[PDB]
Amino acid sequence: GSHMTPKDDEFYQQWQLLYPKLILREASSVSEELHKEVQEAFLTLHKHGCLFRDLVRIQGKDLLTPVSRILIGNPGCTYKYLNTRLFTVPWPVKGEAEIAAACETFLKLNDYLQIETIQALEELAAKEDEVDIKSRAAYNVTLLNFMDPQKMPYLKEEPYFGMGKMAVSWHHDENLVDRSAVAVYSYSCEGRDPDIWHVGFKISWDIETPGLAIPLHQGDCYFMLDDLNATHQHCVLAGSQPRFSSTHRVAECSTGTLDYILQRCQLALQNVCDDVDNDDVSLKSFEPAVLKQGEEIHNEVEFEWLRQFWFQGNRYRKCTDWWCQPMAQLEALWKKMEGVTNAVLHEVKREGLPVEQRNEILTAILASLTARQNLRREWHARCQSRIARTLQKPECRPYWEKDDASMPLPFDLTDIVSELRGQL
């Protein structure tokens, strides 16, 4: 197993024949105006401490990420990677001061890279509607990254091609719009040179075709066009210096915007008599499908939104308070839904209800309350791991003790979920 750099004579033809949807636009092709601003914006965001390592999860194991990142993008948009939902620090489009300046820079960078990507995708088609090109370049977020490699005690070796040290292992960028492009601005402060940063590429499934290691110098950009991200894997090979990147994506956010999740809560609350907001929650229907939907939405807001947000110790507050009202509002909507689950439970215990209507209700809601119990343990335990204790550390929220009648239901549902089974 081997790899090719610009030192190898075969590099230039292997690029053209086995990695042609990869494009490089070097520092020289980007205006000096933009370089200074974009690099000052990285240094700005680093100074204020806006970039954090994430307490991610992979195959059961709780792991801290080598690199430090922040997500910037459209207001209300999220990007999920490695079971962790990141929330946009918003950039200004259609309606704390140094930080708003940096976000606007990365919007300016976003606009530039978009025109470069559309252009590059035109040229790819000429070789091989025009709305498809537009939507596959319509970047809604950028994930900024940072790693000082001298503050890692030992870096993993690249295992298939001898590319040396890896900052990020071989992967695909998850959760992107199908065939969408990715644009990356890179900024560093025998085989491949160990002191220089490279992006590595290989074909999926394949360690026989030699991989490419693309040297990245101060302000070089690369572009993964079309189905590249799916057919190929990439890695980041570490240099000796620290290095930033801004990686612009079209995040598949069909169930990942503030608007989308508010609307889902609005949908669950259609089954609640809504004259007044108090603890007397009563429901319009107990038709199985309506109750199932309500309980599924309760989980969605709790686990995809509330617990994902508060697991990040309010690292967002530091740079922006955009998500503060939204998340208070989502919690209150979730709290009402606790009221709903309580009201459904009340109804199944009613002397008066035919067992036949009771059993049809349980089959509607049990998978949802099952899944609420398991994920509550997973999230609670994940907030309590020895690694998490070491610290703005991860808050388990919402959480409440049994001796607390502000909440209609208990956090531990084992009593409750177990009782509903023995019947059915």
Ligand SMILES: Cc1n[nH]c(C)c1-c1cc(Cl)c(Nc2ccccc2C(=O)NO)c(Cl)c1
């Ligand atoms: C998936 C996906 N979608 N979008 C993105 C940004 C990713 C993504 C992000 C990261 Cl940060 C990592 N890396 C690691 C993560 C945890 C621990 C170690 C490493 C590492 O690789 N050290 O060896 C990989 Cl592999 C993928």
Ligand SMILES: O=C(O)CNC(=O)C(=O)O
């Ligand atoms: O070059 C980069 O830093 C971008 N690549 C990645 O997979 C990443 O976002 O970590």
